[PDB]
Amino acid sequence: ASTDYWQNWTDGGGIVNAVNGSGGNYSVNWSNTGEFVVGKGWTTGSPFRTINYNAGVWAPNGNGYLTLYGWTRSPLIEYYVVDSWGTYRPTGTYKGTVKSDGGTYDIYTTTRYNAPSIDGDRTTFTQYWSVRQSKRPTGSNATITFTNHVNAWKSHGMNLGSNWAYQVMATEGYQSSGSSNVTVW
């Protein structure tokens, strides 16, 4: 599918060189950063979307995630399906696991305080995660059948909001450098 949304955000710390590439493609090259999130996908997310990608370059130097990323409102939830990472594997309150697209993912909840969200610069909100138990290989076509995650999350009392915001396949980094190149469809 064609992508209709380009996500490119930095909290201002360090350097984030993000290139909005042809079609579903983009690259990020980042150096000594604070927080940033770059990716492509859709203005309106859905729990029934299938997201495909191919990360031709996955080269974080430190803390970075190769991850499905999005928001809901009502309630406000920031959510992740993390397929690979750098030096840091994101964890939190263990809920259970879900098998999807050849991988098994741990499910976590965490809470962010006084942090940036789609509704303010200093918000407190819950985060939902599926984090692959081992790094997904990159460079071949990969699929995230997101309904499998949403359904598993629901089965653990993790309810997403009714009002869907953007939904992208992203590179997120914090306190790191690196390079990524990803095509999304």
Describe the overall structure.
It is a single chain. The protein has one domain: Glycoside hydrolase family 11/12, catalytic domain (Jelly Rolls, Sandwich), CATH 2.60.120.180. It is built from one helix and 13 strands; from the N terminus they run βββββββββββαββ. The strands form two sheets. It has an eight-stranded mixed beta sheet. It has 185 residues and is mostly beta strands. A hairpin with a 4-residue loop joins strand 2 (15-20) and strand 3. The longest helix has 10 residues, at 146-155. The radius of gyration is 15 Å and the shape is globular. It catalyses: Endohydrolysis of (1->4)-beta-D-xylosidic linkages in xylans. Its EC number is 3.2.1.8. The active site is at residues 78, 172. Residues 1-185 form the GH11 domain. GO terms for molecular function: endo-1,4-beta-xylanase activity.
